[PDB]
Amino acid sequence: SSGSSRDLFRALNSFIQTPTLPPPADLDAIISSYLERHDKPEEGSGDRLNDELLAIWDKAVQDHPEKYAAFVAVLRQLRPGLGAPARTFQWWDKLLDPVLDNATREKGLARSFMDFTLEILSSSEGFIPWLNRLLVRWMELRSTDLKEQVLTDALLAFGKKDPKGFMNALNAFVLRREHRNSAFSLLCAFVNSGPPHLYLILQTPLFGNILQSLQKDESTFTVNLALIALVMLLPFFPGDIVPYLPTLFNIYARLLFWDRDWDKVLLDPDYDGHSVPYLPEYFTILYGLYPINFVDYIRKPDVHAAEIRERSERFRKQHLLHPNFYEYTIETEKTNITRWLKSEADEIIADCMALVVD
Amino acid sequence: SSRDLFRALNSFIQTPTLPPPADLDAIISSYLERHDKPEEGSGDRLNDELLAIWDKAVQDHPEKYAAFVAVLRQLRPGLGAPARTFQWWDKLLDPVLDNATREKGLARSFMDFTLEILSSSEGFIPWLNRLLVRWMEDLKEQVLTDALLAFGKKDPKGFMNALNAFVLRREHRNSAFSLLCAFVNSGPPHLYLILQTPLFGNILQSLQKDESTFTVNLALIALVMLLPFFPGDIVPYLPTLFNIYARLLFWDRPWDKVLLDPDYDGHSVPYLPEYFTILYGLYPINFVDYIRKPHNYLPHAGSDDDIDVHAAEIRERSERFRKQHLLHPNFYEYTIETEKTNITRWLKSEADEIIADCMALVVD
């Protein structure tokens, strides 16, 4: 009883028929001996194992949700022996909806499937088909339940692996009006999880569409979500936003006068307020990154210009004199990038917060 | 009634009641009535008689000094030439000062005599110089102080012209700067006239050259108090004002200089933070540009790093003041040129308003 493929069939079928909560050590031994003694899974060993796992799922597991967690636990250990890497997709894709429908009711099922997802992403590695399935189910879903945690944590895991792919797929949902609020909410959650290579959003249409929402959408709730995402994103590529400064400043002027005057989101008269709540934080990040250019915009964007100053007064009285005023001109502030070489986003955010008095 | 006036005076000196008797004021009033031109002979004879009484009866009798001053106050309109009143004030100054603490009302009577002189039909430098010299040498101090402030309130430019002579003397600079602070604090008018007098330049000269921490700090307090009274006129002085800040920022590292006093002088100028506030409050864009690029203000060798090391050091030491001040509204309104060129800021503003606006920028 040490590595036979016949043994794996007998041990798995016996375990599925009477599952224990962690798989016993002697089951791990049979699997480990099997994986060692089968070195060519793509030559036939993986195919016969797949047919067996398919049979066990069909005949014994598919219609017994209490057995899902046990089957996933076995599926995690036997993953290296499946053979072609497309078979592991086929199994995760096969288990997605069965796991999602029973995440809140079957103990440990969410945990086992999440560990299964994480192990797939961190082995020997075009995630668009995975992401879209997670995205479409997450958009339709709208205290957090286990079903929503699985979709969120899986989306965050896939986004951590492929940040550029995560944002390209999300951009499609930003373009549709009925999902823009949900897409922007998930974007905030993505940036909050601290994924790498957030600067890749510039090689993707998402950044421009965030700005388009801030310029065109008329719902106070939508624009505020877009503004929160923008404030979180800018510290991750501050030296690359120089061409966007006129747009960013015009967005500030629009939100500053929110009480006055592309698939648009209209105003919701039931919930939308008359001022953008996150506008003060937007002033802070603009003043923290490019103060000399920002105050020059406020100085020289007529009557409307004078009003821009008057409405900026309550933000001026909240910020200390910026150190850039001792070091740079309006030109070298945009051109000299030494500020950004030395500091990362977490330091840059802290430095911006250090300027706020109230 | 000329002759009957003298009879009352001669009798009163030997027979004074602490207030003058009822019969003396009546003769005086009628005397001044029928004497319509005192500078044409009547005032001259009155002076000669008053001198005689002082010599033969008053000079060495201090209790009659107070009585004599009361007589001199009432007969002041009839003395004639304005030099006659000064001659008597000049003549009585030292006798009054020597007995101010011991003879009751004498200090107050001479002060009221001084106030009556200043409030009738009206430079004052000879008055001030006499007061200044004695002040540089308590009711005696109060008389000298109140009179100097009273003369300074009437003639502010003359007060500061006379004070400039004592500022130029090293042994008198600390006291002169202290008196200047007391003068500005007394709220005198026309403080902007200090620019049409050499005193302002010598305040800046002390700030640039003197080496006593105490002296420079006094000069800095005077400068901080003065700027809100003429903020739009200091544009030609900005390079000097900025260089003074840089010198005091590194305090731990002809003209009669006050040297360092090893007994009390510290290693830092206490009033430097307030100087940053007033400079940043009045000309922020020009001030931060000086800190940004002091190359534009200081002779230097462009092929060396000494001007860059100095620039970084000025910035690094200015960090603690930067963290104390809000963003200035000028950064929304002016360029470095129009901040110096646009004077609308200063038209409606008074000294107290400019100070309050400068304080509104301080985080404390």
Side-chain angles (χ1 to χ4, degrees):
Chain A
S1 64
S2 173
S4 171
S5 172
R6 170 188 192 77
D7 280 328
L8 181 65
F9 297 165
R10 179 176 95 92
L12 301 176
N13 286 291
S14 170
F15 167 72
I16 291 303
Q17 180 177 355
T18 304
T20 43
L21 276 125
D26 47 9
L27 184 67
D28 301 314
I30 302 306
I31 291 181
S32 297
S33 296
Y34 170 85
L35 301 177
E36 296 169 16
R37 294 173 41 158
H38 296 72
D39 204 7
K40 295 180 179 179
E42 294 179 60
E43 217 266 335
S45 184
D47 295 89
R48 293 177 282 272
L49 173 59
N50 191 29
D51 297 4
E52 177 66 21
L53 289 175
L54 281 170
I56 293 170
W57 172 262
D58 194 62
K59 311 303 281 188
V61 189
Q62 187 176 17
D63 318 319
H64 295 80
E66 61 278 8
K67 296 181 191 300
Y68 285 177
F71 183 79
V72 174
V74 156
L75 195 54
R76 293 172 51 194
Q77 302 182 27
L78 283 172
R79 181 181 60 81
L82 293 174
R87 222 106 73 160
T88 60
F89 171 80
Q90 290 171 345
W91 275 107
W92 186 106
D93 196 300
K94 184 181 185 60
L95 302 190
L96 179 58
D97 289 329
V99 164
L100 289 182
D101 295 340
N102 300 275
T104 70
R105 289 176 289 175
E106 306 302 319
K107 292 188 185 184
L109 177 56
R111 194 40 173 156
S112 67
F113 184 78
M114 266 308 307
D115 292 323
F116 182 49
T117 300
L118 293 170
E119 291 164 351
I120 295 175
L121 295 177
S122 82
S123 70
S124 70
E125 289 163 2
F127 286 112
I128 289 299
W130 301 89
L131 286 157
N132 287 146
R133 290 208 70 207
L134 295 181
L135 281 170
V136 65
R137 256 136 292 240
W138 192 87
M139 301 289 172
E140 292 172 6
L141 201 145
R142 321 178 82 82
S143 61
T144 298
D145 50 289
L146 274 178
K147 176 178 161 75
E148 176 180 5
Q149 284 239 79
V150 168
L151 282 175
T152 301
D153 294 1
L155 277 165
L156 288 186
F158 277 89
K160 188 183 194 161
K161 191 75 189 188
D162 186 15
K164 175 173 169 45
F166 179 83
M167 283 167 160
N168 265 322
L170 186 65
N171 181 77
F173 292 87
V174 178
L175 293 172
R176 296 199 286 117
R177 156 196 47 241
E178 64 278 5
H179 290 127
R180 191 165 302 150
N181 287 342
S182 292
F184 281 161
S185 297
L186 182 63
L187 179 57
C188 294
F190 179 60
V191 180
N192 196 262
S193 65
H197 309 301
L198 279 179
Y199 57 86
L200 292 180
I201 197 180
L202 298 186
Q203 296 174 24
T204 247
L206 181 56
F207 189 73
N209 283 322
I210 297 167
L211 304 189
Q212 192 153 184
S213 176
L214 288 160
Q215 290 181 142
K216 299 174 182 192
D217 286 336
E218 302 177 356
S219 171
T220 311
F221 187 81
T222 306
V223 176
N224 189 68
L225 282 183
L227 194 61
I228 292 176
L230 180 62
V231 171
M232 297 180 64
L233 283 164
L234 293 179
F236 287 93
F237 42 94
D240 305 309
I241 68 177
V242 171
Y244 295 95
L245 287 183
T247 303
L248 297 171
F249 295 156
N250 287 338
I251 290 174
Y252 164 81
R254 185 205 186 202
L255 307 189
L256 192 62
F257 288 89
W258 191 252
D259 54 308
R260 301 231 210 96
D261 209 330
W262 181 261
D263 196 13
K264 194 188 304 293
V265 179
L266 306 177
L267 185 82
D268 187 7
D270 293 5
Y271 301 158
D272 282 336
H274 310 318
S275 64
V276 183
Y278 221 67
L279 182 59
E281 295 80 351
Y282 188 46
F283 183 99
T284 291
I285 195 61
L286 292 177
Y287 178 77
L289 295 183
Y290 293 89
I292 303 176
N293 284 265
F294 191 25
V295 306
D296 190 77
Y297 174 83
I298 298 175
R299 179 187 64 87
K300 194 198 297 288
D302 195 78
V303 170
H304 184 263
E307 288 172 359
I308 295 183
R309 285 194 279 261
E310 180 55 41
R311 293 195 171 208
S312 299
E313 275 295 294
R314 71 177 172 102
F315 298 136
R316 181 191 62 77
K317 299 182 186 175
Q318 289 175 40
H319 290 79
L320 301 162
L321 181 66
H322 199 287
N324 280 22
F325 289 104
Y326 290 166
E327 242 158 324
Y328 306 102
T329 65
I330 188 174
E331 300 86 4
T332 54
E333 176 179 89
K334 296 177 297 185
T335 281
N336 194 324
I337 46 88
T338 301
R339 282 182 297 156
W340 319 124
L341 288 178
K342 296 177 70 172
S343 294
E344 291 286 21
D346 67 325
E347 321 189 348
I348 290 159
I349 298 174
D351 290 332
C352 291
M353 300 304 127
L355 300 165
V356 179
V357 310
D358 278 321
Chain B
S1 300
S2 57
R3 295 180 181 177
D4 290 341
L5 179 66
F6 298 164
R7 176 187 57 88
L9 304 177
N10 291 293
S11 170
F12 168 71
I13 292 302
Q14 59 184 160
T15 62
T17 302
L18 299 175
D23 291 342
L24 306 179
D25 304 320
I27 303 178
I28 291 181
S29 170
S30 177
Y31 169 86
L32 301 177
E33 156 261 325
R34 74 170 294 264
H35 297 72
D36 204 7
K37 287 182 153 311
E39 291 177 21
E40 295 190 342
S42 57
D44 296 20
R45 298 179 179 177
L46 173 60
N47 279 108
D48 296 4
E49 183 66 22
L50 288 176
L51 189 55
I53 293 170
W54 175 261
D55 191 62
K56 299 177 178 172
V58 191
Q59 178 177 355
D60 273 72
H61 294 137
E63 66 280 8
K64 297 181 241 310
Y65 284 175
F68 183 79
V69 174
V71 187
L72 196 53
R73 293 173 52 193
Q74 302 181 26
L75 282 172
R76 181 181 60 81
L79 293 174
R84 297 303 179 175
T85 302
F86 175 79
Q87 288 168 20
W88 278 109
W89 186 100
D90 194 357
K91 186 179 186 60
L92 303 190
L93 180 58
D94 290 329
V96 164
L97 289 182
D98 296 340
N99 300 275
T101 70
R102 291 177 291 175
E103 308 304 319
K104 185 190 180 296
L106 177 57
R108 295 180 181 176
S109 181
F110 183 78
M111 187 60 210
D112 291 323
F113 181 48
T114 299
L115 293 171
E116 291 163 352
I117 296 174
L118 294 177
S119 299
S120 70
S121 299
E122 318 231 24
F124 285 110
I125 289 188
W127 305 81
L128 287 156
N129 286 340
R130 274 276 268 150
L131 296 181
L132 281 170
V133 154
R134 304 241 185 284
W135 190 86
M136 299 279 176
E137 292 172 6
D138 191 299
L139 273 177
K140 178 177 162 185
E141 182 257 59
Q142 286 172 10
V143 168
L144 281 175
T145 301
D146 294 1
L148 277 165
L149 287 186
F151 277 98
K153 186 184 193 162
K154 195 75 189 301
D155 185 15
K157 175 173 169 45
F159 179 83
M160 294 178 289
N161 265 130
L163 186 65
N164 181 77
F166 291 87
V167 178
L168 292 172
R169 289 294 96 247
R170 150 189 48 87
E171 63 277 5
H172 293 330
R173 191 164 302 150
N174 287 342
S175 292
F177 281 161
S178 297
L179 182 63
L180 178 56
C181 294
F183 179 60
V184 180
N185 197 79
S186 65
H190 310 114
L191 278 179
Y192 56 86
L193 293 179
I194 197 180
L195 297 186
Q196 295 174 24
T197 205
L199 181 55
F200 189 73
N202 283 322
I203 297 167
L204 304 189
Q205 190 151 180
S206 177
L207 288 159
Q208 290 182 233
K209 299 174 182 192
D210 285 336
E211 302 177 356
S212 171
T213 310
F214 186 81
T215 307
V216 176
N217 189 67
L218 282 183
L220 194 61
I221 292 176
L223 180 62
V224 171
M225 296 177 70
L226 283 164
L227 294 180
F229 287 88
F230 42 94
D233 305 309
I234 68 177
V235 171
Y237 297 94
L238 286 183
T240 303
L241 298 170
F242 295 156
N243 287 338
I244 290 174
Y245 164 81
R247 184 206 185 202
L248 307 189
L249 193 62
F250 284 65
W251 190 252
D252 53 11
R253 184 182 298 273
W255 180 261
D256 195 14
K257 297 192 313 177
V258 179
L259 309 178
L260 184 82
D261 188 6
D263 295 76
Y264 291 167
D265 283 336
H267 300 308
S268 65
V269 184
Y271 221 67
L272 182 59
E274 295 80 351
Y275 188 46
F276 184 99
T277 291
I278 196 61
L279 292 177
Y280 177 77
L282 296 183
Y283 293 89
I285 303 176
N286 284 266
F287 191 25
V288 306
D289 190 77
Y290 175 84
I291 298 175
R292 179 189 65 87
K293 194 191 183 193
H295 308 63
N296 284 357
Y297 295 83
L298 299 173
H300 67 271
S303 55
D304 301 336
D305 297 321
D306 301 54
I307 190 59
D308 303 308
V309 169
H310 179 263
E313 288 172 359
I314 295 279
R315 285 191 278 262
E316 198 62 277
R317 292 195 171 208
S318 298
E319 276 295 294
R320 58 156 172 166
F321 298 135
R322 181 190 62 77
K323 300 181 187 175
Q324 289 175 354
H325 290 79
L326 301 163
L327 180 66
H328 198 287
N330 280 21
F331 290 105
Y332 288 167
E333 197 157 357
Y334 304 101
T335 66
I336 188 174
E337 291 302 294
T338 53
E339 176 179 271
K340 296 177 296 185
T341 280
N342 194 323
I343 46 88
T344 310
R345 282 178 296 157
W346 319 124
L347 290 177
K348 295 180 184 185
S349 295
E350 298 289 303
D352 66 325
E353 322 189 46
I354 290 159
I355 298 174
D357 290 332
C358 290
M359 294 300 152
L361 300 165
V362 178
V363 186
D364 57 357

